[model samples]
Target: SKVVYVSHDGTRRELDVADGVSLMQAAVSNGIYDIVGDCGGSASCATCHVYVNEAFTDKVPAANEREIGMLESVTAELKPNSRLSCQIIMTPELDGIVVDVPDRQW
Candidate 1:
């Protein structure tokens, strides 16, 4: 399992995720906030926006063009590490990864 940290509303939560699951899925399964996941894992919604921790940013794959475009529509502040949680595939190699969710999803 991989451990990920998600923050929202001034609260930070840790989740133990299984390999091969999408980050969004893990967050939802673990009840992390600010990730609505309205479209499930189809990548059709920007509800799963998250910022990768700077220290582990390089370990995650680059966002695809579609994810980048969709992310542009999110209301949260975008950072260099901004990413769509749905785009991240959990793996053992990602153990201890951390991400932060904005205070709001709109």
Candidate 2:
């Protein structure tokens, strides 16, 4: 299992996650807040937007067209590291990943 460190607002969560599910699902399961994932993993929503900690950026896959388009609609400030959690499936090298949730999501 790979542990992910995720923070939102002033709170944080640690998940010993498996590879099969997307980050959004993991957050939902563990009661992490601010990840609405409105369209589930359909790539039709940016509610799962998160900022990848600087160190784990490259370990994540590049966003595809749908996710890129969806992310462009995020309500928070967009950074180069912004990503849709539903679009990120975990991998071994991506263990210890730190994901920061924004103040809000629309």
Index of the highest-lDDT prediction: 2
lDDT of 1 by residue, 1-106 (tens): 6656657655667677888898888888887757868878777878888889898899888888888788887779878888889899988888888888887788
TM-score of each: 0.90, 0.90
Q: What is the model-wide C-alpha lDDT for candidate 1?
A: 0.82
Q: Least lDDT summed over 10 consecutive residues: which range in candidate 2?
A: 1-10
Candidate 1 residue 58 C-alpha distance from true site, Å: 1.0
Relative to the true structure, candidate 2 reaches a TM of 0.90
Residue runs of model 1 more than 4 Å from their true location after superposition: none
Per-residue lDDT tens digits of candidate 2, residues 26-45? 88888775886889789998
lDDT against the true structure, per candidate, is 0.82, 0.82
* RMSD, one per candidate, in order: 1.4, 1.5
